[model samples]
Target: SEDIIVVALYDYEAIHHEDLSFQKGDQMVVLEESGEWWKARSLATRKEGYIPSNYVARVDS
Candidate 1:
């Protein structure tokens, strides 16, 4: 997905405990794909998550 690739720098501190006080606008790479969640690799920390694909942004070019 070019839209996903055309993101800004890696700052993945956004998904915090309170869901706040987190670094945002990070580019995450999609990992394992599943019906439940899309495992991802945060560009910042290389952290993985099976986040809902709906949560990911697909910006218009």
Candidate 2:
């Protein structure tokens, strides 16, 4: 019921398709995380894809 805001301090992202990830300041919603796969709603462009969970991190308060 609440929004998943990103923590300003401990946020990071992958290079442009380099690792199929976004950069810092990138806020996204974690739809699902299973093993090394995750689906999220990107805040940058609202793009959704199958990103590896190893590169996905979140700090919610």
Candidate 3:
């Protein structure tokens, strides 16, 4: 499977939690995978958190 690559589908905000916050055009690396939610690290901050799987698409290229 593809790894370490994904793009944010749109802007998302974490509610003062450990979840990752990202804006449109933000990029991150997949640290772990899940059906409903995936753990990722922000490319900009390297901060790790969980984000909805539907909120992003894998970067195959």
Estimate the Cα RMSD of every predicted model relative to the unseen true structure: 6.4, 4.8, 2.0
Model 2, 1-61: lDDT tens digits are: 5543332223445444423255545666666555665566666776655455555455562
**lDDT tens digits by residue: candidate 3, 1-61:** 6555788888988764669998778888888777877788887898978777687878842
**Which prediction has more favorable lDDT, 2 or 3?**
3
Runs in model 1 lying further than 4 Å from the true structure: 1-24, 58-61
* Candidate with maximal TM-score: 3
Pairs with steric clashes in candidate 3: none
What would you estimate as the lDDT of candidate 3? Answer: 0.79
Model 2 lDDT, residue 32, Cα: 59
Better by TM-score, candidate 2 or 1: 2
Choose 1 or 2, whichever is better by lDDT. 2
Name the lDDT of candidate 1. 0.44
For 12-42, candidate 1 gives per-residue lDDT tens digits of: 3335332211133545566545563445565
After TM-score superposition, the amount by which residue 16's alpha carbon in candidate 3 deviates from its true location, in angstroms, is: 6.1
**Residue 39, candidate 1: alpha-carbon lDDT:** 56
User: Rank by lDDT, descending?
Assistant: 3, 2, 1
